[PDB]
Design a protein around this ligand. Structure first.
Ligand SMILES: Cn1cc(NC(=O)c2nc(C3CC3)ccc2Nc2cncnc2)c(C(=O)NCC(C)(C)O)n1
Ligand SMILES: [Mg+2]
Ligand SMILES: [Zn+2]
Length: 313
Protein backbone atom coordinates (compact mmCIF):
# COMPACT_ATOMS: atom_id res chain seq x y z
CA UNK A 1 0.00 0.00 0.00
CA UNK A 2 2.75 2.50 1.06
CA UNK A 3 5.01 0.64 -1.48
CA UNK A 4 5.38 3.12 -4.41
CA UNK A 5 7.36 2.01 -7.50
CA UNK A 6 9.88 4.77 -8.51
CA UNK A 7 11.74 4.75 -11.87
CA UNK A 8 15.12 6.39 -12.52
CA UNK A 9 14.85 10.15 -13.34
CA UNK A 10 15.19 9.86 -17.19
CA UNK A 11 12.35 7.24 -17.30
CA UNK A 12 10.22 9.08 -14.65
CA UNK A 13 10.25 12.16 -17.01
CA UNK A 14 10.34 10.37 -20.42
CA UNK A 15 7.43 7.90 -19.50
CA UNK A 16 4.84 10.75 -19.29
CA UNK A 17 5.55 11.57 -22.98
CA UNK A 18 3.70 9.75 -25.85
CA UNK A 19 6.88 8.82 -27.82
CA UNK A 20 8.46 6.91 -24.88
CA UNK A 21 10.41 3.70 -25.73
CA UNK A 22 10.24 1.13 -22.83
CA UNK A 23 13.86 0.10 -23.53
CA UNK A 24 15.62 -3.27 -24.10
CA UNK A 25 15.70 -4.37 -20.39
CA UNK A 26 12.86 -6.98 -20.27
CA UNK A 27 12.95 -7.31 -16.46
CA UNK A 28 12.09 -3.56 -15.97
CA UNK A 29 8.85 -3.82 -18.04
CA UNK A 30 6.66 -5.34 -15.24
CA UNK A 31 7.75 -2.54 -12.83
CA UNK A 32 7.09 0.03 -15.60
CA UNK A 33 3.51 -1.35 -16.10
CA UNK A 34 2.90 -1.30 -12.28
CA UNK A 35 4.20 2.32 -12.03
CA UNK A 36 1.70 3.17 -14.84
CA UNK A 37 -1.28 1.42 -13.11
CA UNK A 38 -0.47 3.23 -9.77
CA UNK A 39 -0.29 6.75 -11.34
CA UNK A 40 -3.11 6.14 -13.89
CA UNK A 41 -5.57 4.28 -11.59
CA UNK A 42 -4.22 4.37 -7.98
CA UNK A 43 -2.14 2.29 -5.49
CA UNK A 44 -5.56 0.86 -4.32
CA UNK A 45 -6.86 -0.25 -7.80
CA UNK A 46 -5.12 -3.72 -7.54
CA UNK A 47 -3.71 -5.93 -4.69
CA UNK A 48 0.03 -5.70 -5.60
CA UNK A 49 0.61 -9.49 -5.15
CA UNK A 50 -2.33 -10.48 -7.47
CA UNK A 51 -1.24 -7.84 -10.08
CA UNK A 52 2.44 -9.04 -10.17
CA UNK A 53 1.32 -12.73 -10.48
CA UNK A 54 -1.14 -11.73 -13.32
CA UNK A 55 1.53 -9.63 -15.15
CA UNK A 56 3.99 -12.61 -15.13
CA UNK A 57 1.34 -15.16 -16.36
CA UNK A 58 0.45 -12.75 -19.24
CA UNK A 59 4.21 -12.45 -19.99
CA UNK A 60 4.48 -16.29 -20.01
CA UNK A 61 1.67 -16.65 -22.68
CA UNK A 62 3.02 -14.09 -25.26
CA UNK A 63 5.36 -15.98 -27.70
CA UNK A 64 8.88 -15.29 -29.04
CA UNK A 65 7.79 -13.71 -32.39
CA UNK A 66 9.55 -10.62 -33.89
CA UNK A 67 6.69 -8.06 -33.30
CA UNK A 68 3.55 -9.54 -31.61
CA UNK A 69 5.45 -10.11 -28.34
CA UNK A 70 5.61 -9.09 -24.61
CA UNK A 71 7.41 -5.77 -25.60
CA UNK A 72 4.40 -4.89 -27.88
CA UNK A 73 1.95 -5.74 -25.05
CA UNK A 74 3.79 -3.28 -22.68
CA UNK A 75 4.40 -0.60 -25.43
CA UNK A 76 0.59 -0.59 -26.25
CA UNK A 77 -0.21 -0.36 -22.47
CA UNK A 78 2.10 2.74 -22.20
CA UNK A 79 0.41 4.63 -25.14
CA UNK A 80 -2.93 3.96 -23.27
CA UNK A 81 -1.32 5.34 -20.01
CA UNK A 82 -0.19 8.51 -21.88
CA UNK A 83 -3.77 9.06 -23.30
CA UNK A 84 -5.46 8.60 -19.88
CA UNK A 85 -2.95 10.87 -18.01
CA UNK A 86 -3.58 13.62 -20.69
CA UNK A 87 -7.42 13.11 -20.46
CA UNK A 88 -7.62 13.04 -16.62
CA UNK A 89 -11.36 13.74 -16.01
CA UNK A 90 -12.94 12.16 -19.15
CA UNK A 91 -12.73 8.43 -18.13
CA UNK A 92 -14.41 6.49 -15.25
CA UNK A 93 -12.51 4.56 -12.50
CA UNK A 94 -13.47 1.17 -14.10
CA UNK A 95 -12.44 2.37 -17.63
CA UNK A 96 -8.86 3.25 -16.43
CA UNK A 97 -8.69 -0.14 -14.56
CA UNK A 98 -10.08 -2.10 -17.57
CA UNK A 99 -8.19 -0.47 -20.50
CA UNK A 100 -4.59 -0.75 -19.14
CA UNK A 101 -5.22 -4.52 -18.56
CA UNK A 102 -6.93 -4.93 -22.01
CA UNK A 103 -3.84 -3.34 -23.75
CA UNK A 104 -1.42 -5.68 -21.84
CA UNK A 105 -3.57 -8.69 -22.94
CA UNK A 106 -4.73 -7.48 -26.44
CA UNK A 107 -2.23 -9.77 -28.38
CA UNK A 108 -2.04 -12.68 -25.82
CA UNK A 109 -0.70 -15.85 -27.55
CA UNK A 110 -0.13 -14.17 -30.98
CA UNK A 111 1.58 -16.66 -33.42
CA UNK A 112 2.85 -14.00 -35.92
CA UNK A 113 0.00 -14.58 -38.47
CA UNK A 114 -3.13 -12.56 -39.46
CA UNK A 115 -6.82 -13.67 -39.32
CA UNK A 116 -6.55 -14.10 -43.18
CA UNK A 117 -3.78 -16.75 -42.86
CA UNK A 118 -5.68 -18.64 -40.08
CA UNK A 119 -8.72 -18.78 -42.48
CA UNK A 120 -6.67 -19.88 -45.59
CA UNK A 121 -4.68 -22.39 -43.44
CA UNK A 122 -8.11 -23.65 -42.18
CA UNK A 123 -6.78 -23.32 -38.56
CA UNK A 124 -9.13 -24.58 -35.77
CA UNK A 125 -9.61 -21.06 -34.24
CA UNK A 126 -11.16 -20.03 -37.64
CA UNK A 127 -13.85 -22.75 -37.09
CA UNK A 128 -14.52 -21.54 -33.49
CA UNK A 129 -14.44 -17.75 -34.43
CA UNK A 130 -15.37 -16.75 -38.05
CA UNK A 131 -14.57 -12.97 -37.56
CA UNK A 132 -11.95 -11.20 -35.40
CA UNK A 133 -10.56 -14.78 -35.13
CA UNK A 134 -7.34 -13.92 -33.16
CA UNK A 135 -8.82 -11.00 -31.11
CA UNK A 136 -11.58 -13.32 -29.80
CA UNK A 137 -8.78 -15.86 -29.03
CA UNK A 138 -6.76 -13.08 -27.22
CA UNK A 139 -9.78 -12.20 -24.97
CA UNK A 140 -10.35 -15.99 -24.42
CA UNK A 141 -6.73 -16.10 -23.09
CA UNK A 142 -7.14 -13.02 -20.77
CA UNK A 143 -10.38 -14.59 -19.29
CA UNK A 144 -8.43 -17.90 -18.82
CA UNK A 145 -5.64 -16.21 -16.74
CA UNK A 146 -8.00 -13.87 -14.77
CA UNK A 147 -9.55 -17.26 -13.60
CA UNK A 148 -6.19 -19.01 -12.67
CA UNK A 149 -5.84 -19.09 -8.81
CA UNK A 150 -4.46 -15.91 -7.16
CA UNK A 151 -4.91 -14.01 -10.52
CA UNK A 152 -8.43 -12.46 -10.12
CA UNK A 153 -7.10 -8.83 -9.93
CA UNK A 154 -10.73 -7.50 -9.96
CA UNK A 155 -11.83 -9.50 -6.85
CA UNK A 156 -12.94 -6.29 -4.93
CA UNK A 157 -15.39 -5.13 -7.70
CA UNK A 158 -19.11 -6.09 -7.28
CA UNK A 159 -20.49 -8.86 -9.60
CA UNK A 160 -21.90 -6.03 -11.89
CA UNK A 161 -18.67 -3.86 -11.80
CA UNK A 162 -16.69 -7.07 -12.66
CA UNK A 163 -19.02 -7.83 -15.64
CA UNK A 164 -18.70 -4.11 -16.63
CA UNK A 165 -14.85 -4.32 -16.70
CA UNK A 166 -14.64 -7.70 -18.59
CA UNK A 167 -17.12 -6.15 -21.15
CA UNK A 168 -14.84 -3.01 -21.41
CA UNK A 169 -11.84 -5.44 -21.84
CA UNK A 170 -13.78 -7.66 -24.40
CA UNK A 171 -14.82 -4.67 -26.67
CA UNK A 172 -11.29 -3.17 -26.24
CA UNK A 173 -9.54 -6.44 -27.35
CA UNK A 174 -11.96 -6.95 -30.34
CA UNK A 175 -11.41 -3.26 -31.36
CA UNK A 176 -7.74 -4.13 -32.20
CA UNK A 177 -9.05 -6.12 -35.24
CA UNK A 178 -7.99 -3.36 -37.77
CA UNK A 179 -10.73 -4.77 -40.13
CA UNK A 180 -13.15 -3.08 -37.62
CA UNK A 181 -11.11 0.25 -37.32
CA UNK A 182 -12.29 1.58 -40.76
CA UNK A 183 -16.07 1.69 -40.06
CA UNK A 184 -15.59 2.63 -36.36
CA UNK A 185 -13.50 5.77 -37.27
CA UNK A 186 -15.80 6.59 -40.26
CA UNK A 187 -18.78 6.61 -37.77
CA UNK A 188 -16.87 8.80 -35.24
CA UNK A 189 -15.80 11.21 -38.09
CA UNK A 190 -19.49 11.91 -38.98
CA UNK A 191 -20.58 12.12 -35.28
CA UNK A 192 -17.82 14.75 -34.53
CA UNK A 193 -18.45 16.72 -37.80
CA UNK A 194 -22.33 16.68 -37.62
CA UNK A 195 -21.71 17.39 -33.88
CA UNK A 196 -23.91 14.46 -32.65
CA UNK A 197 -20.92 12.87 -30.75
CA UNK A 198 -21.94 12.45 -27.04
CA UNK A 199 -19.61 10.82 -24.41
CA UNK A 200 -22.55 10.18 -21.96
CA UNK A 201 -23.96 7.88 -24.74
CA UNK A 202 -22.39 4.43 -23.87
CA UNK A 203 -22.54 3.25 -27.59
CA UNK A 204 -20.41 6.37 -28.48
CA UNK A 205 -17.96 5.57 -25.56
CA UNK A 206 -17.42 2.01 -26.91
CA UNK A 207 -16.57 3.62 -30.33
CA UNK A 208 -14.09 6.22 -28.85
CA UNK A 209 -12.49 3.42 -26.70
CA UNK A 210 -12.30 1.42 -30.00
CA UNK A 211 -10.32 4.28 -31.64
CA UNK A 212 -7.99 4.57 -28.55
CA UNK A 213 -7.22 0.79 -28.88
CA UNK A 214 -6.23 1.14 -32.60
CA UNK A 215 -4.28 4.40 -31.81
CA UNK A 216 -2.29 2.57 -29.03
CA UNK A 217 -1.87 -0.62 -31.12
CA UNK A 218 -0.30 1.28 -34.13
CA UNK A 219 1.73 3.59 -31.76
CA UNK A 220 5.12 2.40 -33.23
CA UNK A 221 4.29 4.90 -36.09
CA UNK A 222 4.21 7.62 -33.31
CA UNK A 223 7.82 7.19 -31.98
CA UNK A 224 11.03 9.04 -32.90
CA UNK A 225 12.23 7.93 -36.37
CA UNK A 226 15.03 5.57 -35.13
CA UNK A 227 12.49 3.57 -32.99
CA UNK A 228 9.78 3.52 -35.76
CA UNK A 229 12.35 2.59 -38.50
CA UNK A 230 13.78 -0.30 -36.34
CA UNK A 231 10.29 -1.60 -35.26
CA UNK A 232 9.32 -1.63 -39.02
CA UNK A 233 11.94 -4.48 -39.41
CA UNK A 234 10.19 -6.49 -36.63
CA UNK A 235 6.65 -6.07 -38.14
CA UNK A 236 8.00 -7.02 -41.65
CA UNK A 237 9.76 -10.13 -40.16
CA UNK A 238 6.26 -11.45 -39.21
CA UNK A 239 4.78 -10.26 -42.61
CA UNK A 240 7.52 -12.04 -44.72
CA UNK A 241 7.27 -15.19 -42.50
CA UNK A 242 3.46 -15.26 -43.18
CA UNK A 243 3.98 -14.79 -46.95
CA UNK A 244 6.44 -17.76 -46.82
CA UNK A 245 3.56 -19.79 -45.29
CA UNK A 246 1.12 -18.32 -47.89
CA UNK A 247 3.56 -19.47 -50.68
CA UNK A 248 3.71 -22.94 -48.91
CA UNK A 249 -0.16 -23.28 -49.31
CA UNK A 250 0.17 -22.42 -53.08
CA UNK A 251 -0.93 -18.74 -52.73
CA UNK A 252 1.20 -15.85 -54.10
CA UNK A 253 1.05 -13.39 -51.17
CA UNK A 254 0.24 -9.64 -51.44
CA UNK A 255 3.55 -7.76 -52.04
CA UNK A 256 3.52 -6.54 -48.38
CA UNK A 257 4.10 -10.16 -47.20
CA UNK A 258 6.51 -11.09 -50.08
CA UNK A 259 10.18 -10.93 -48.93
CA UNK A 260 11.24 -10.72 -52.64
CA UNK A 261 9.37 -7.31 -52.67
CA UNK A 262 11.53 -5.25 -50.18
CA UNK A 263 12.01 -2.42 -52.78
CA UNK A 264 8.18 -1.70 -52.51
CA UNK A 265 8.28 -1.31 -48.65
CA UNK A 266 8.77 2.51 -48.39
CA UNK A 267 5.72 3.07 -50.73
CA UNK A 268 3.74 0.40 -48.77
CA UNK A 269 4.38 2.45 -45.54
CA UNK A 270 3.14 5.69 -47.30
CA UNK A 271 -0.11 3.88 -48.28
CA UNK A 272 -0.40 2.60 -44.67
CA UNK A 273 0.36 6.07 -43.15
CA UNK A 274 -2.14 7.81 -45.51
CA UNK A 275 -4.73 4.94 -45.37
CA UNK A 276 -4.80 3.89 -41.64
CA UNK A 277 -2.51 5.87 -39.21
CA UNK A 278 -2.88 9.63 -40.14
CA UNK A 279 -6.71 9.19 -40.19
CA UNK A 280 -6.64 7.14 -36.87
CA UNK A 281 -4.79 9.91 -34.92
CA UNK A 282 -6.50 12.86 -36.77
CA UNK A 283 -9.94 11.53 -35.64
CA UNK A 284 -8.54 10.74 -32.14
CA UNK A 285 -7.21 14.35 -31.72
CA UNK A 286 -10.62 15.74 -32.93
CA UNK A 287 -12.23 13.76 -29.99
CA UNK A 288 -9.29 14.04 -27.48
CA UNK A 289 -7.27 17.21 -28.36
CA UNK A 290 -4.43 16.46 -25.84
CA UNK A 291 -3.54 13.39 -28.00
CA UNK A 292 -2.27 15.82 -30.74
CA UNK A 293 1.34 14.61 -30.06
CA UNK A 294 0.47 11.17 -31.64
CA UNK A 295 -0.66 12.92 -34.90
CA UNK A 296 2.53 15.13 -34.90
CA UNK A 297 4.75 12.03 -34.29
CA UNK A 298 2.89 10.08 -37.02
CA UNK A 299 3.26 12.87 -39.67
CA UNK A 300 7.03 13.27 -38.88
CA UNK A 301 7.44 9.50 -39.54
CA UNK A 302 5.27 9.92 -42.72
CA UNK A 303 7.85 12.56 -43.91
CA UNK A 304 10.83 10.23 -43.01
CA UNK A 305 9.24 7.55 -45.35
CA UNK A 306 8.92 10.13 -48.22
CA UNK A 307 12.63 11.00 -47.60
CA UNK A 308 13.58 7.26 -47.90
CA UNK A 309 11.82 7.10 -51.34
CA UNK A 310 13.67 10.33 -52.45
CA UNK A 311 16.97 8.48 -51.69
CA UNK A 312 18.07 11.12 -49.05
CA UNK A 313 18.07 7.99 -46.79
C1 LIG B 1 1.96 -2.15 -46.83
N1 LIG B 1 1.21 -2.33 -45.58
C2 LIG B 1 1.74 -2.30 -44.32
C3 LIG B 1 0.71 -2.49 -43.42
N2 LIG B 1 0.71 -2.51 -41.99
C4 LIG B 1 1.80 -2.14 -41.31
O1 LIG B 1 2.78 -1.78 -41.93
C5 LIG B 1 1.74 -2.11 -39.82
N3 LIG B 1 0.70 -2.73 -39.25
C6 LIG B 1 0.53 -2.75 -37.93
C7 LIG B 1 -0.62 -3.49 -37.32
C8 LIG B 1 -1.71 -4.08 -38.25
C9 LIG B 1 -2.01 -2.84 -37.39
C10 LIG B 1 1.43 -2.10 -37.08
C11 LIG B 1 2.51 -1.42 -37.62
C12 LIG B 1 2.68 -1.41 -39.00
N4 LIG B 1 3.78 -0.72 -39.50
C13 LIG B 1 4.79 -0.18 -38.66
C14 LIG B 1 5.62 0.85 -39.10
N5 LIG B 1 6.55 1.33 -38.30
C15 LIG B 1 6.70 0.84 -37.08
N6 LIG B 1 5.94 -0.14 -36.60
C16 LIG B 1 4.99 -0.67 -37.36
C17 LIG B 1 -0.44 -2.62 -44.25
C18 LIG B 1 -1.78 -2.85 -43.73
O2 LIG B 1 -1.89 -3.53 -42.71
N7 LIG B 1 -2.84 -2.30 -44.38
C19 LIG B 1 -4.20 -2.52 -43.89
C20 LIG B 1 -4.79 -3.72 -44.62
C21 LIG B 1 -3.71 -4.58 -45.30
C22 LIG B 1 -5.54 -4.57 -43.57
O3 LIG B 1 -5.69 -3.21 -45.63
N8 LIG B 1 -0.07 -2.53 -45.52
MG1 LIG C 1 -3.97 -8.06 -32.54
ZN1 LIG D 1 -1.38 -5.50 -31.22
Amino acid sequence: GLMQFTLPVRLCKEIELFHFDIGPFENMWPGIFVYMVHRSCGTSCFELEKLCRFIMSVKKNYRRVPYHNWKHAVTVAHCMYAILQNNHTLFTDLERKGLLIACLCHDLDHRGFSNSYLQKFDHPLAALYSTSTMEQHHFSQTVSILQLEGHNIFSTLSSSEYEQVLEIIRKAIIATDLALYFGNRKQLEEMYQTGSLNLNNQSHRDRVIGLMMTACDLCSVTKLWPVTKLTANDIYAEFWAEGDEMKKLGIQPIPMMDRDKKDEVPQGQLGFYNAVAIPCYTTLTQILPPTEPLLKACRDNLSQWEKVIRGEE
